[PDB]
Symmetry: none
Subunit: 76 residues, 4 copies
């Protein structure tokens, strides 16, 4: 099944970030499997509507994953 | 598209009822308030199924409930 | 314990609405024991920062509970 | 009190993130009050030694906050 905005809106607010995480994790894992768990947790801070867009836009998710990777990188 | 009824919804599990009502409500709410659509939909899905079925056939009533939900979401 | 914005921010995003719900429910139940579960669920749609303010301000919580009660009220024919 | 690496190291791992969060949050809130909670949660995924450096380097905290803000920025 594909997570729609109506299906997410129908779920209790307590379960929405969990549901988005479950779908985000395999996609992030297909790009950067080593930091996927950490990156997933970070990207879950993004508003739910933007996360639903990212679940359907591979290049938008890619650029956010790359931005999260840069956030984790320590100073030179 | 079929008219949803209280008896037809009562036959399905409670979360499935909310999903069915949510699928009809979300596109209409998004047409009014696209930014808060997901939040408004989630909120309005707490209303009794019979009142929700009325609102799905009464654009005037849906709009006033959406405006009431928007007031609830407004910060102080 | 009182839920601070820093304590909520340190929790995983998957747990934040659940944590806010656990704090909101007893307070809502105290002024509206009837549809407390529904009101809590509705108010959890509000942004987390505004919910943290509402947990500290009884003023804003009561008015939001009253507004939620109005949303639940069925139309008069 | 000033948070030293030895003081942080003496506490359990999750207690360490909460302690760093308590120091990071007011500084991040001063910069971006609306996104403070989200930015703090995301920056807490960074290694504790790099977080302690950022708490003592206002310029490096600012550049990390800006990177986190870009991660949160919606496509529209
Ligand atoms: Cl809007
Ligand atoms: Cl801000």
């Amino acid at each position: 099944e594909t997570l729609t905005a109506s299906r997410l809106a129908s779920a209790p607010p307590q379960k929405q970030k969990q549901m988005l995480g479950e779908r985000l994790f395999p996609l992030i894992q297909a790009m950067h499997p080593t930091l996927a768990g950490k990156i997933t947790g970070m990207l879950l801070e993004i508003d739910n509507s933007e996360l639903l867009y990212m679940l359907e836009s591979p290049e938008s998710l890619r650029s956010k994953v790359d931005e999260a990777v840069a956030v984790l990188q320590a100073h030179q």
